[PDB]
Design a protein around this nucleic acid. Structure first.
Lengths: 84, 332, 332, 84
DNA sequence: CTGAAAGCGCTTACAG
DNA sequence: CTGAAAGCGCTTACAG
């Protein structure tokens, strides 16, 4: 299980289609993936969940990945949310 | 059209029932013969007939969306979200405009329903008691979007339009502003007189400010409808120090109404809009607005709906995403 | 679902083939018995199965639209028009976004084609040689919208983007303006470097003005992409006296770019946009723009398409609506 | 055959959906109906035609109606285009 | 894995 | 006007 706290240099943050892309991006990994936000964490391969947090710019969030490609996953996800 | 599952049964020396197993993809065939089947398919150009599969499977892989008017940026985004999450679950879509009137809606409804849709995302500014009791017996799953309907007998993703209005009208109050009007859309739309207005008045009375019928004027939904209201306020004794608007465009047409009257925003009046449209940041000054995640409201309602057709576990049929406020150059 | 044409054959004491004749509406039945059939239908709630009719009639009453991105006001209107004319000819619609990329388009295409659509309205900013030779053998009629494709082997309603650009870039010239830049979208989209740019340069060279590579800068399509370009011009020796923009938003973001640099529009520079979006009149100053009737482009392409499926007489597969210019507060 | 020259106090004129509504409005009459514009006239129950003229505000146009309800038709059409 | 058969609901030509 | 029959292309249970 690999963990990481990240900012979200995104301008729209994790909402709108960006959000929706994040989820599709997440599914390119066999690794159960997750996203924690100030305490509540949801499945990151689930649109329902990820969108209920409404994570806007400036928020820092922990993302979790447990599976064959957890490093690979994490590498990408955090990377994406980094805007950078 | 000419190349069938039969003609694959021919060139594959397999059974018609074999050919089906491979396309749909149900494990349980001889991989050795499976490929024998995937070849002819690429070799012949065999495009399966979605219709033939429909009559026989009793499922179509299609949802029908009833939406007010796909030409307004507002419903626009809403549409994309629904379209996306759907294109993601391999579910096709059927769209049409209800022009907001009833006898056109129930029609689109009952129509799509006969087209054999496997589901329906439905959004209208008015969900008459009639339609409810109509949707309620739809042979396929239904889910509402951006729509309000008091009973909750139908699954729906929506935000709290009242808080929204409240939590914004308060922003004004904490800024001293004690005389703030409210430019509203069609008051008849329950998603206004039963959600925004109350959310508006809940903020006044709650903090002990008045509630007179000279701060809440009506008008159509477009740019112009906002130029009017403004005028009615300056040209009145209850000098409006600021205004709350249920639509960005409207606001955008109020910002102007006032500058043309020479007044300065915000020194002369802070103004906060609603929806947070890409149009919001387009104005000058920049319009602070109540955020209503449409792309999300749509993506969720579809996603939710898929999680019904496939009969998964729903934990709530009353989904509500949250909201915020994007403060900009229209307020201190 | 449970009430069939069979069960009407039952309660109507008529033949299954009778029941069909009445629903479809082909004259040739006993009115005396006809009504005997229209009763059970209302009495039983018999909703015909659009699918069963599809497999047997070899027609679906549905067109599929491949559109870039339904979330941009531009394609928005375009969609409504298509949706309207279609809802008028009792033809249902299937919409989806191509995100402008190829391997997603040909996919949507070949997909809808298998869904059994009776037709297809298709619009993309890039109609690669591939797609043409692909659309060309589509089993059902096709018609392009707002799209450009040099050969003309496929029916299409489009306007003259070159004249458009020309007839606007000239407006500038007749106003003395001899140093006018051009803020363009993705130059790679043939509907720019093969239509607007040339229409742009055709106006310069034609009237004897220069054509240097310091007046035609690129940038994305949204608001921001317009704030950049502006900057690049003032901060240059070929002082741009005015600018032509291939998108309203872009322009809208150029009007601003300049006022922030303190300059005054138009005293310091006239600016004319493109599309004439409802967003156009939203800005301040009011943006004069090249009119591109999208609602019409869509309504026509659909209407035209219907006049193909039903096999009527087409007199031209190269339809072009006209254009104009809406002069406002952005030009003298 | 009943004829009439009319202005078009419409703001958008005969384009966009307004145009499209004009045509559907036209079809509520059995009377062959037509619209002349500075010389070229097309069937007013046809979307193709009416839209090719691109009739904007301020233009005056002759509308023709020949049939059982020509008066009725005309009454309405001119009325509609009158914005008033 | 895997054939054969029956059946999805309507329509379309073919004989009255 | 108008029945009876065959057929649209796939799938779904049912026996191997």
């Amino acid at each position: 299980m690999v963990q990481q706290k990240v900012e979200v240099r995104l301008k729209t943050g994790l909402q709108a289609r960006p959000a929706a892309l994040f989820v599709q991006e997440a599914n390119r990994f066999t690794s159960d993936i997750f996203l924690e936000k100030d305490g509540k964490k949801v499945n990151a391969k689930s649109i329902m969940g990820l969108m209920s947090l409404a994570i806007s710019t400036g928020t820092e969030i922990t993302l979790i990945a447990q599976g064959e490609d957890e490093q690979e996953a994490l590498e990408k996800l955090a990377a994406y949310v980094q805007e950078e | 059209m000419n190349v069938t599952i039969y003609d694959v049964a021919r060139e594959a020396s397999v059974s018609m029932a074999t050919v089906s197993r491979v396309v749909n993809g149900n494990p349980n065939v001889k991989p050795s013969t499976r490929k024998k089947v995937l070849e002819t398919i690429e070799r012949l150009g065999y495009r399966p007939n979605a219709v033939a599969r429909g009559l026989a499977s009793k499922k179509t892989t299609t949802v029908g969306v009833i939406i007010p008017d796909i030409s307004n940026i507002f419903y626009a985004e809403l549409a994309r979200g629904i379209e996306d999450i759907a294109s993601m679950y391999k579910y096709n879509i059927i769209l049409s405009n209800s022009d907001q009137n009833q006898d056109k809606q129930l029609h689109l409804l009952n129509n799509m329903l006969g087209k054999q849709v496997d589901g329906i995302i439905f959004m209208s500014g008015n969900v008459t008691e009639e339609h409810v009791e109509e949707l309620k017996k739809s042979p396929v799953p239904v889910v509402l979007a951006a729509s309000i309907e008091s009973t909750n007998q139908i699954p729906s993703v929506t935000i709290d339009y009242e808080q929204a209005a409240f939590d914004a009208v308060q922003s004004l109050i904490d800024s001293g502003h004690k005389n703030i009007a409210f430019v509203s859309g069609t008051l008849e739309e329950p998603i206004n007189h039963a959600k925004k207005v109350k959310g508006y008045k809940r903020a006044l009375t709650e903090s002990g400010l008045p509630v007179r019928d000279s701060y809440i004027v009506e008008g159509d939904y477009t740019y112009d409808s906002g130029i009017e209201a403004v005028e009615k306020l300056l040209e009145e004794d209850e000098k409006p120090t600021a205004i709350f608007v249920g639509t960005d465009e409207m606001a955008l047409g109020v910002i102007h109404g006032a500058q043309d009257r020479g007044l300065n925003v915000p020194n002369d009046l802070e103004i906060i809009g609603f929806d947070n449209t890409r149009l919001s940041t387009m104005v000058r000054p920049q319009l602070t607005s109540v955020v209503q995640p449409m792309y999300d409201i749509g993506a969720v309602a579809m996603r939710l709906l898929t999680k019904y057709m496939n009969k998964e576990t729903v934990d709530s049929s009353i989904v509500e995403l949250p909201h915020r406020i994007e403060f900009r150059q229209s307020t201190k």
